[PDB]
């Protein structure tokens, strides 16, 4: 996102505003204002590691924009927006993740290598890989009889189409000591 | 495996009446060992379960997204709003006797995936068979009835 001093009004808020959000949601509900529409409007820019060196980036827009003139103990401990030099804003922190890790529920609540492991098992899984499975004459294929969408999903999974072609079933799990089997 | 690197093979299959039950009549589809939690530190596995339980009760697709303002204490308040011990646990009764289990078990759904390695695909045995031509020793692999 591009963040500039722009509007005399207050501080240095983002270039993109609620208007463009609705403008996009308009084209969304139609299924005119695309991604190229944000890009050529100069509200959003493409940055490589070499260019990243000469910028400062705000994590969340809101949580990283006004100033200080109670708190929930249950919530995590976040830092600050004391920077007034903000040049850009991160669309969403969860976009640092690739396809495999994007399927992990609450990965910010797991010891990091455990996440790297489920990044490999997601491949040794089953389900519908395509809907044309009955037409395809592949060397080997496994289709799960009754797949179920997951009960806990990530905002990112909506785009990975998992909800349509799932990898498992939601099992009623008891975490217990029984027979010892 | 769950979506937290928590893999495993089956140990045994039990029927409904051998299985432990909630007074509600709900029986588990899976029984996973508590031991595989502290060492691993898969807190997100437990949180998935608590959220997944809430979701099924209320007819929602539980947001388990990463950097959010969702709390364990928030979801716990919701699960109590449905009528279950806020932390997931439920008093269960042993299948063989009907007698209550002194411990309350953390029950509820977790999304589990079936993995591409079946035992009947791995199992191998040989007592004489095909031998290599040069070396005159047993051949390699299940397919080739190898040693």
């Amino acid at each position: 996102f591009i963040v500039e001093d722009d509007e005399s009004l207050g501080h240095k808020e983002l270039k993109v505003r609620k208007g463009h959000i609705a403008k996009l949601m308009a084209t969304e509900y139609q299924d005119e204002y695309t991604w190229s529409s944000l890009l050529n409007e100069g509200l959003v820019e493409y940055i490589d590691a070499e260019e990243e060196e000469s910028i400062l980036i705000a994590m969340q827009p809101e949580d990283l924009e006004p100033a200080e003139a109670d708190v929930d103990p249950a919530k995590r401990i976040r830092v600050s927006h004391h920077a007034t030099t903000f040049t850009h804003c991160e669309i969403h922190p969860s976009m640092i993740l690739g396809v495999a890790a994007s399927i992990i529920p609450f990965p910010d609540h797991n010891q990091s290598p455990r996440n790297t492991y489920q990044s490999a098992m997601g491949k040794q899984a089953m389900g519908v890989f395509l809907t044309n499975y009955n037409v395809r004459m592949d060397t080997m294929a496994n289709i799960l009889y009754y797949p179920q969408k997951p009960l806990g999903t990530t905002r990112a999974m909506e785009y990975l189409k998992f909800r349509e072609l799932p990898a498992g079933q939601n099992a009623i799990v008891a975490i217990a000591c029984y027979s010892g089997y | 495996a769950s979506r937290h690197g928590q893999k495993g093979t089956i140990g045994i299959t039990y029927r409904r009446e051998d299985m432990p039950f909630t007074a509600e009549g709900i029986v588990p589809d899976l029984i996973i060992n508590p031991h595989a939690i502290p060492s691993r530190m898969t807190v997100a596995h437990l949180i998935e379960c608590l959220l997944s339980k809430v979701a099924a009760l209320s007819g929602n697709e539980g947001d388990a997204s990463p950097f959010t303002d969702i709390t364990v204490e928030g979801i716990s308040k919701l699960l109590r709003e449905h009528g279950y011990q806020s932390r997931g646990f439920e008093v269960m009764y042993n299948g063989h006797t009907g007698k209550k289990l002194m411990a309350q078990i953390f029950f509820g759904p977790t999304y589990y995936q079936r993995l591409r390695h079946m035992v009947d695909d791995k199992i191998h045995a040989r007592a004489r068979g095909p031998m290599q031509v040069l070396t005159r020793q047993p051949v390699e692999g299940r397919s080739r009835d190898g040693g």
Binding site: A22, A26, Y29 | L51, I70, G74
Partner: peptide, 15 residues
């Protein structure tokens, strides 16, 4: 707590 999908409903009612 859960994911918000009632925006076929929310967006059609507002616009």
């Amino acid at each position: 707590f859960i994911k918000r999908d009632r925006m076929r409903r929310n967006f059609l009612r507002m616009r």
